[PDB]
Every structure is written in structure tokens, then in C-alpha cells.
Amino acid sequence: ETTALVCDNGSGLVKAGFAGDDAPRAVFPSIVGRPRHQGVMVGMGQKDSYVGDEAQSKRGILTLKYPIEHGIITNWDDMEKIWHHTFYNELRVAPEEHPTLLTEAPLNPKANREKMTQIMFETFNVPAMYVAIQAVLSLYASGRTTGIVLDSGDGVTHNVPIYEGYALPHAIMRLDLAGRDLTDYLMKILTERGYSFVTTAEREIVRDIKEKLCYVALDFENEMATAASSSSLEKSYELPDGQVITIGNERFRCPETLFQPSFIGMESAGIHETTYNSIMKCDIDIRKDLYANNVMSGGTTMYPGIADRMQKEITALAPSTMKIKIIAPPERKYSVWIGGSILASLSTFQQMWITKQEYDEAGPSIVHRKCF
Amino acid sequence: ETTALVCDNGSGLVKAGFAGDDAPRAVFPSIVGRPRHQGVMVGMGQKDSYVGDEAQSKRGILTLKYPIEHGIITNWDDMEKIWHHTFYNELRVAPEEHPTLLTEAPLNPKANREKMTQIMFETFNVPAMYVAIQAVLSLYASGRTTGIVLDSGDGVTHNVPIYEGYALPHAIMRLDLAGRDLTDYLMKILTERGYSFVTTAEREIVRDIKEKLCYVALDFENEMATAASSSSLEKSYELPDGQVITIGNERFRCPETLFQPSFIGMESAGIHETTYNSIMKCDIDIRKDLYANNVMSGGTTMYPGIADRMQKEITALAPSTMKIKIIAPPERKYSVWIGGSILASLSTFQQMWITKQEYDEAGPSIVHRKCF
Amino acid sequence: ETTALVCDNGSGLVKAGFAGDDAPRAVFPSIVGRPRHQGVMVGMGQKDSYVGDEAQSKRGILTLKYPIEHGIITNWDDMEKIWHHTFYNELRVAPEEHPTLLTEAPLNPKANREKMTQIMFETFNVPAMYVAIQAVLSLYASGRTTGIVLDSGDGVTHNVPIYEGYALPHAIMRLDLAGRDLTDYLMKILTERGYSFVTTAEREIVRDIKEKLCYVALDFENEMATAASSSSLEKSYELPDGQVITIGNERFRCPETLFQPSFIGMESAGIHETTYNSIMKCDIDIRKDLYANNVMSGGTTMYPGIADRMQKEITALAPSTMKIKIIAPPERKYSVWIGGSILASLSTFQQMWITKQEYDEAGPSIVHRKCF
Amino acid sequence: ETTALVCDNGSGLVKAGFAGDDAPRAVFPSIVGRPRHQGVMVGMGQKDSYVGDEAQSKRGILTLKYPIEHGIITNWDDMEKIWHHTFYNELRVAPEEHPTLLTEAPLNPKANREKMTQIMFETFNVPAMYVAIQAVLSLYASGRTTGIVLDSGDGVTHNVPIYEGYALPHAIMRLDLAGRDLTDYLMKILTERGYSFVTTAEREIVRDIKEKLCYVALDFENEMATAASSSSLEKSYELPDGQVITIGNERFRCPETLFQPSFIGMESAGIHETTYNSIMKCDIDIRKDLYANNVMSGGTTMYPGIADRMQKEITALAPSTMKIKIIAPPERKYSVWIGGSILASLSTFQQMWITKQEYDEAGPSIVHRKCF
């Protein structure tokens, strides 16, 4: 045996690599694009579909779409097309030799995990597989046993409280506000400056505006007063046609949707009150250890100043004698993959794989009574 | 006080009148024309500019242009010239005595509404004003509280879901396909018959072809089979030079762009799928009442057979146990003005005006925290 | 100031008079004759040159020639000799007191208009001048703003479409078939009867045959069948030597050259197809108003039956639902002067003159950026 | 099979040859002339019609006319006469053995392409044919996939944006200002020097003046100031009668009609603003690649200094951080034929022909659902 594969399929990026590494060798977006215009040059390399980094380059003529929406895979033809691109075109492996570690969000459909298991054996014919929960793997990456994990990615934000090795599945919150809903609110409030980004190729531009110019205001009602003297507030951004946009208070205002989800019409609470309501559903003897370990992960927790507001605004909810310590590693974008590289290389793990023999005598329903 | 003014400025027509009436006294196109040829007769009444019904008559020698494109006013010199023509030359009022109700599209620039407010006080010096959203006013005209409003005009098509008095601003779709983009597609597909309408004075002829000979096919793939036996399909039209054109399948084919916007190269969805995606972004307890109230308005919803296809094609998307009732009044062209005549004559409204005193101590930014 | 002068210099006649009158006081041909024989009576009043009505009387012993051929003045010594005869010998004015309105054909050389301007200031020293286009002035005489003008004179036939005060300079046709080319075709087809008019004094007789016995056939292929029974077709004419000529089908056949210019070997089209091709180069919204206003002017449009054939033969080209109205005033010979009398007496015109001060600081090139 | 024919039928020239060559073997003008004079020598080789290079030599006695005006073939008798001259008299082939590649302009009538297809099978009986779009073939000649193509010929100027193999048919502009409208403006402004070119045989002289003495001014308002000191500006040209003309500012002033079409009374924009408005109708992610690839083609883009003004005047419209690279090959006159020689010799193309069997069971309407 050489090694094992760790394929972190997310709603926005597909992180992939080998176990035992410290960074994924394969980071490309989870986009499958079909061309939508006519097509008039004969031959000269026109494929029926473009996946990932190729569709990101040719995106002006493509109808881009995501096969994964809010964690749930909705377009199993396109998801088998990304996995085919991930293993062959991007990692250059043989899938019949390496065991594959997959990740998915908690509180997810049963058929979403059975259908991953059916594809990895009946189509790729892997020797073994295992589906892990992402917020469990975010805590191997920090090398811990205790802590609540705020894993906010591109499709789903979810808290999982984990005390000393033991997960508390009744306190797992799942909030479907994520980075893809911050882009779609940003396309709505860039309209009030005048700039109209509508089609799906501009959705990948407003995503790139958000990753470069948006931050989290430490007090939202005071930065809106700073928009009176919009001097250091406004920044510029060069679009791929050469135009510039002067984005102003829309920098700090779209990540406030993480803290006030009523901006996009959701009745639910922000990520500071879904952390606090998930600690307050735990036992009273472990709430001191969950305050002191607030592990953030995922790429939506990469804004400048989001650890400073989570530490500010849980403290206004928690009793004043408990210390709050939001713990943000700088590598926290890939930490679901970093913990998957650790868990697949542990020596105590090689009896937890779902082998091909164990699958065949049990069908696709083996994955529920074996993984979690 | 005599009464209030209701000035519905659209991208294609300027509807204007007084509150409490049942029809606008002033319907003229929103066109400002400059002459482009030499000019050789001395004197005898040559103005520098021609606005509205006058420029529509003298259009053979004029460079006609619209100051409003896609809802956004782009040419504030010409828009102050239409308003000057609307009040003085067309309504024959004094603007310093009547409060003016203005309309504009939702999801619009902030500077578009501030600059209307700055003109109506610093130039016309009105006693009071109020900017209303057009799809709110389309629902007073039907005398209701509940319904999604498909307001398709000449610059912008937009859905606004309104439950029992409460607007849902996160489900407001805005699609910039409208009647001016159906004319420009019709000038492109009349070329394949041979007829070349190019200059801006022929743009007002193809607009008049579209308002007389175009309808909506109930099944587009079967009317294209009827173009084999083009017997009852083809109609004729007498041009203003005496020529006739025999338009064939181009009758039903340009309003299909409302239902398949890929004909003009837009990635977005048709008006039957922007209604359905705007209901599916509402709460699940109000989707039954939004199906049963589909208020159409605007002049682009005046084609023969557009209520019959909207009722056909939402039903193919909606679940089969929900009833769909597309509600098209016959007066639906002016229904943004009809609801503006109702709202300005309500007794509960006279504290919602932005008076001249309230403007002066607040600047032009009063209109955002007072209207909507 | 007394009044202004209107000097309509044509290729065949010099119409001159004062502004505000209804008929020119000075109508004499534009002929400068030199004697060609010996000269044997000593003294008794022999001048070196004879101009106009005097050379028309003494024409048997003179080499008559026209200084203006096809609108272009080619013999500037003789044209200064006609203007000297026009002002002093014929109007009896002082040129240093009256401003002079001049006319010329459209699409004319630049040096033709500069050299008129140089003569009227450096030789006659007029206070002011203005060069107008003849087909503009033909439309003041009918008191209008809209119409295409068929101005066919003795040197040039030209259409100028004029919509409501605005000339369309890209649709101005200029056809150099005129009355002097109908005389020269008539001298060629009177030869086939036997009568040989060759020298220049007989050119002024065939011009007088044409003004008295020639008409326009309403259908040319049927009047040629009437030449079989030449009973009412043939007329007689008494020459100035007492001889008679019996002109037959040559009455209607030389004005057919206006409608079929291939008789004199021109490739171009007739005056019914240069009117139609000049309307079809206009905008499609003004073609209805140019059909209903077909102003004829000039002396070549004075044949019996030319309005009846223009109305017949444009109708065969125009679409059948457009009305055609050829508009021939009875005074249409002088209508370039009649409109020049109107334009020079308008009150809105006295700032359009090129004064002597404006000329001196600008040279002769002022006339292009001031008149047209 | 020997090879295939590439017949580039243009409005001004008929380029023809074989596939796989680097230059057409048959370049002759698209002129069919009928004699117009009497004809008095008995026998000695007088045909009823003269086509192409023969009618160009004998043009003094012929009524020359073009069967193709603005891309649309209007005179199908004469166009079958050119094709008969092209294959038999000029290429000396048998049309029943070679498959024929035809070109035509985009946004063209449907009946123009059906009637080419009906002639090439029912009259010439070719084995196969294919109608291609000219601006697609202009991009094979530069050997590319990406670029907007400014193909300005003798009848039609049209932009076609082509990204990586995929044409964008909603951004295709078509402007009917071309070289034949620059000749007709040049015949109008040579009149103001005095020189009157009127009949159709002089239309082929002013075309030859334009191809030798006209250039494009880099700044039009400064070359008009250079016309004050007309020293290096004026050139001479020897006419075929031996006369000389001293053309002055009319050298640079007629190609300015390409950049200001209001000189000939067109309301539309120049070729620098129909390129920019066609890029601004594309997607925002491909506008960087269309700026860097501005392929000019056709013979109207052969003026000295037209690449230097297109690079100057798009840059004044484009944002200042985007590079503009107008790409003019020196062989750009024949580049529609050069790309047609490439496309007909590709190995991936031989299933795109419309064979004679495929035509017979489908009628003439096969060409729309098979070519484009």
C-alpha cells in the first residue's frame, strides 16, 4: 500500500491530496460549466463540458453551475464529473489502489451519504472508504479533543460541540447561511452603487471582490457613521474589463449578514448566537471548556476582524466571569483537509475503513452503522 | 390645497395626471430629440430640442434618444427637459403648489433617487414629494394586499412579492429584459426577411409593428411547425412610406424572448421562472396565496396570450395541487399610475410626504430613510 | 437704407430687381456678343461688345456666347460685363448702397462662389451680400417648409429635399440636362426634316421654337403612333426670314429627353427617377410629406403637360397607397426670384448678410462658413 | 476527388480559387455590363453582355451595374452570369466535380442563402456546398480562435466577436457603410473642385482615385488646418483622357466617413464605436481578450493609417488600463479567401458539406439548419 486519499468536497472548492501531507495538492473550484453560445470554429479542441480551473478561465462563454448546494449534492452527473477530474486529471492516481477519505456536513440527508458510497465502489472501485464529519476533522487540525467548532464554508455553517473525544449530537446546530449567500447579498447591494452583476460569470467576480475588500466591522452602528466621512472607508477594485468600482460601506456590510441574518430575510440567529445556543444546550459542567476553545474553520471565517467580533459578542452573552477565547489558526481555510490528513494517517484508524468486501454483503446502507 | 400630481416616469412613456382621476391626462413618450441635418429656412419656428409628442411627429430629421435606460436616468439634462414639458406644456400647472408623487423601479441606484429629490425641490420647488415603488402601486390598482407583481415595462421587468401589507425585499427579482429589448431583437430578425430598420426613427416603427402584430405563442415548438403552412400566420403592415411588409413567424417569436432570454444572449431565466424563483424564496406558508394572485402590469404584459402562457408554464413548475391564477386587468398598462392616483388620495398618507422643510435640514439623503 | 437687390443670375436669363416686389424689373438673356464681320461705317455707334437685350436684337452679325455653362461661370470677364449692364444700364442703381442677394445651384464648385464674392466687394463695393441656393428660394415662393424641389432651368436640373426647415444635403441630386441641352437636341432632330440651324444666331431661334411649339407627351409610345396620321400633330412656325417650317413629331420628342436622357447619350435617369431616387435617399418617416409636395420651378418646367406626366410617372414608381401631388404654380418661371424677394425682406435675415467689414478680415473664404 | 473550390463572392470583387492555395487564381470585379449605344459594325464579335475584366476594359460604351448591393444579391440573372464566368471562363473547371465553398455576410436575408443553394445544385450540379460567414473565415487566416473581426468590404461593414471557438451572435453589428459609399461620397466632394464624375464608367475611376490617393487622417481637425498650407497635402492623378486633377483635402476626408458617418447622412456610429459597442455587448470576462485581438480584414481597411487611428480612438473609449492591439496583416484584402482555403482543406470539415443527396430530400431550407 502506498497511501490514502483525502478528498474534501466542499460547496465552493474541492480540496484533495494525499494523507500525511501538510497542504492539498489539488485546490480548484467545484464548478461544472457547459458552453451556451453557438460554436463556429470547426475542431480545435472544444469539449462538451469544462470542470474546475478550466471552466474558471473560460467562464465568459459558459453557464457555470455548482453541483453542491448547501452541502446536498443535487446534480450527481456533475459530481461524478468533478471526482473524475479530481483523481485522473488533477491528482493523476489510480482510484483502484488508494482508499478515499470523504467529508460531509452534519445533519445531512441519508441518501447523500449512501450515494457517495455507491459511486466510490461501483464506479471508481476504491479498496476502502470512510465518510467523516467536517467539524470533527477541524479539531484534529488544531490537535485537540475539546472545543466547539464553528465551521463556516461556502454552503453551510454548523456548530459541533465536542468534549473530550465525545460528540454531543443534540447540540449540533446547522445554519445554511454561508459564503454563497454572502455573495448573493453582495450582488444585491452593489446594485445600489449602480453596478449590475447578474449572470453567472459575474458571480465569480463578486466572489473575488468579497475575498479582497470585505472585512467585519467591530461595531456595525459606528462604521455606518464613518460612512458619512467616506475617506478611508472606500476602496477600489479593477474588474476584468478594466473598469473600476468604488465600493464603500458595502465592504463591512455584507459580512454583517453572518451576525444579522435578517438582512437576507432569514428568521434565524447569527453565528454568535448559534454558538451560544449550542453551548447552552450542553451539560453545565462542560460549558467552561467550550468557552475557552472556540475553533473557527472554513473560508468564510477568513475575514479581517471576525475573531475580534466573535470574542466581543459572545462575551456580551456569556456570564462575565467566564473567559472566551476564539481560536483562529492562520491555515484555517484548509483545516478540514489538514485534520483529514491526520486522521487517515493514524495507526488506530485502519479498521474503521469500509472495505469493498464489507460493502458487497451489506449494500449502500453500511455507511450509517459504520461511520457515524 | 387643490390636489396632488402623480408623475409616472417610465422608460418608454411618461404617464402624468392628478390624483383622484381614473386615467392620466398626459401620456407621451419619453423621447428628447435634437435635429441632425443642416437647417436652411430662416426663422419660422425651429427649436433647439423637441420633446415627446412633438419629437414623435418630426422624427425623420431628429436624433431621438431616451434619457432613461433600464430604469436608471442617465441624461439628467434631458430628464429635466421632459419634466419641464410635462408640468408646463402638458399639464399646465404651477409646480410650486402641487405635491408630486414619483415612481421608480426597485433595486435601483441610490443616486437615482437622490437626484430626483434634488431636482423636484431645487428646480421646481414643489411643496412635497414622495418616491414610490412601482410594483407596490400596481397592487393598489387591483385593490389588494396580497400578490406577487410581474411589472414588465419598457426598461425593466421585476417581481415584487407582497403578502398582507408586508413586502419581502429579499425575494425581489429584477430582470433588465423589457420592451426596448424586444424591439431591438425584432429589428434583428426583420433583417432576415430583408427589411433593414437601422436608424432611430425606424426604431419607433418597429416598436409600432410590435404593438400591433406580435402575440405570444402558447406552445412555441408548434407555431414553428405552423410556419410550414404560413397561411393564417403571416400578416401585413403598412409602413409610413407606403411600403408593406409580410411578417411571418416573427410575430410570435420576439415575445418568446420574455420566456427564453437566450435569444438575446442573456444567461438569466424567463419571466415564468423569475416568478417561480421569487415565490420559492418566500416563506412556505405564504406560497399558496402568491400562486393565487399573480398581478401582471406594465405594457409589455399587453400581448395577446401572455396570461394564457404564464398560467400554463408556472403550472408546469408549481406542484400540481396548487391553483395558479394569473390576474390581468384590461387597464393594466396604466396600473402603476392608477395605484398612484389611489395612494396619493388616501387620507392616511398626508404625513408620508417629504416636505420642503424636512428636505432643507436633511439634504438629499432624506429620501432613503423616509420613503423605503 | 432704401432696399436690397435680388440678382438671380441664371444660365439663360438674368432676373433682377428689388426686394419686396412681386416681379423682376430686369429680365434679359445672359448673352455677351462680339461682332464677327468687318465693320465699314465710320463712327455711328459701334461698341466693342453687346450684352443682353441689345445683343439679342443685333444677333445676325454677332458671335453670341454664354458666360455661364451648366451653372459654372466660365468667362469671368463677360460675367462682370453682365453685372455691369444689370446694375447700371438696366436697374439704374448705385451698387455701393444696396445689399445684393445672389443665387447659385447646389453641388457647385467652391471657386465659383468665392469669385462671385470677390467681384461684388472688390469691384462693385456693395455694403453686404449673401449667396443663396436656388431650390431653397423656390420654396419660399410657394410659402412652405416641406417639399422636394425640382428646379430645372437652362443649365442644371437639381432636386433638393427640404423637410420642415431642414435641408437634407445627402439627397441633393444634380443633373446637368436642362433647357440648353433640349435646344441642342432639337437642332439635331430638325435636321431630319431638312432644316439646318447651325450658327449661334439660329440657336436663339430653335430656343424660340421650343418655347412655343413643344409639349410633353403623356404617353410617348402612343404619340409616335399618332405621327402616322399627322393631322393635328404638325404645327407651323414663321422664321425671321419669312420661311415656314412644319414641325411634326419633334414637338413632343425633345422634352422626352427630360424623361429619357439616353436620347442625348447620357447614362443617367430622367427627372421622374431622379425625384424618386432622391426621396428614397431620405428618411422613411418623411417620404410621405415629400410625395405630397413636389414643387416644380424654373423655365424648363413650363411645357404644357409636364405636371401631368410627373404625376403619372412617379405614381408608377411610388407605392400605390401614397398620394402624389405635383405642385406647379403658374408663375413658376420666376419663383427663384420670388422667393429671393421674400427672403431679403424678412426681418429675421439682416444678420445673415456678409458685410464689407466681415469680408475684409476673412478673405473670400468667408462665404462657405457663413452662407451654407 | 481532386480538391474543393472557394468562391468568395463580394460586392466589389469575386475572389475565387482552389482550397489549399495561398492566393486566389481569379480576382475580377463583380460587374455585368450591357452595351448602351447603337452598334453599327456587322459581326466582329459583339456579345450581349460583358462580365468582369472584359467589362472593365470596354466600360466606356457599357451600362455597368453590380448584381450585389450591400451584400444582398438583387439581380439573380446577373449573378448566375458571374458564376458562369467564374467557373468556366476564369477557373476552367467542371462544376459537377468540385465542392464549392461560398461566403456571405452575417445578418443577411434567409432567401439570399436559399437562392445561392438552389443555384449551385439545380444549375451547376455541384457535389457539395457550404455557406460560411465571412468574419469567421477572416480569423482562420490569422490562425486564431479569439478576436473581434472588423470586416469592412465594398458592400457591408460588420463586427463579429468570436471568443475561443464560440461566436456571440447577439453582439454582431452590421453597418452598411462600405467602400461603395466612400466612392459615392468622393464623387460628391470632387464636384467642389470642379470635376464632375457622373456616369457609371467614371464611378470606376473615382474608385481608382480612392485606392491610390486617399489615406486616413490621424487627427481630422488638424489635417483640415494643414489645408491652409496645401503644399504636401495636394497630389495629382492622371485620368484616362490625359487630364490631371489636383485633389487636396479630399484625400483624407472621404475615409473620415468611416469614422463620422454623418457626412453621408447616416445616424449610426463610426467603425471605432461599432467595435466598442460590440465588445460592450459581450460578457465582462472576455472583454480583455477582445481588446487584444482586433482583426481587420477586407479592402476598405487598406487605407494608409487606419490601424493607427483605430488604435488611437478605441483607446479613448476603452478604460485606460486595457491594452488595445489592432491587428492588420498586410494580406488582409484576401483574408476571407485565405481562411476559406484553410477551412476547406481541414480534415475535420468533410462531414459539414451539404451534399446533393442531403439537399434533395430537404429542399432549399437545409442550409439554415446545417451551416449556421
Ligand SMILES: Nc1ncnc2c1ncn2[C@@H]1O[C@H](COP(=O)(O)OP(=O)(O)NP(=O)(O)O)[C@@H](O)[C@H]1O
Ligand atoms: N479570504 C477570504 N475572505 C473571505 N471569504 C473568503 C475568503 N476566501 C474564501 N472565502 C469564501 O469561502 C468560500 C469557500 O471557503 P471554503 O471553506 O473552502 O468552502 P468549502 O469549505 O469548500 N464549502 P463547504 O466545506 O461545503 O462548507 C468562498 O466561496 C468564499 O465565499
Ligand SMILES: Nc1ncnc2c1ncn2[C@@H]1O[C@H](COP(=O)(O)OP(=O)(O)NP(=O)(O)O)[C@@H](O)[C@H]1O
Ligand atoms: N399593445 C402592446 N402590446 C405589446 N407591447 C406593448 C403594447 N403597448 C405597449 N407595448 C410595449 O410596452 C411599453 C409600454 O410602456 P410602459 O409599460 O409604460 O413602460 P414603462 O412603464 O413606461 N417603463 P417602466 O415603468 O420603467 O418599466 C412600450 O414601450 C412598448 O414597448
Ligand SMILES: Nc1ncnc2c1ncn2[C@@H]1O[C@H](COP(=O)(O)OP(=O)(O)NP(=O)(O)O)[C@@H](O)[C@H]1O
Ligand atoms: N414657355 C417655355 N416652355 C418651355 N421652355 C421654356 C419656356 N420659357 C423658357 N424656357 C426654357 O427655359 C430656359 C430659361 O429658364 P430659366 O429657368 O429662367 O433659366 P434660368 O433659371 O435663368 N437658369 P437657372 O438659374 O439655372 O435655373 C430657356 O432658355 C428655355 O430653354
Ligand SMILES: Nc1ncnc2c1ncn2[C@@H]1O[C@H](COP(=O)(O)OP(=O)(O)NP(=O)(O)O)[C@@H](O)[C@H]1O
Ligand atoms: N488600396 C486600397 N485602399 C483603399 N480602399 C481600397 C483599396 N483597394 C480596394 N479598396 C476598396 O475595397 C473594395 C473592395 O474590397 P473587398 O473587400 O475585396 O471587396 P469585397 O470584400 O469583395 N466586398 P464584400 O466582401 O461584399 O464586402 C473596393 O471597391 C475599394 O472601394
Ligand SMILES: [Mg+2]
Ligand atoms: Mg469546508
Ligand SMILES: [Mg+2]
Ligand atoms: Mg411602468
Ligand SMILES: [Mg+2]
Ligand atoms: Mg434659375
Ligand SMILES: [Mg+2]
Ligand atoms: Mg469581403
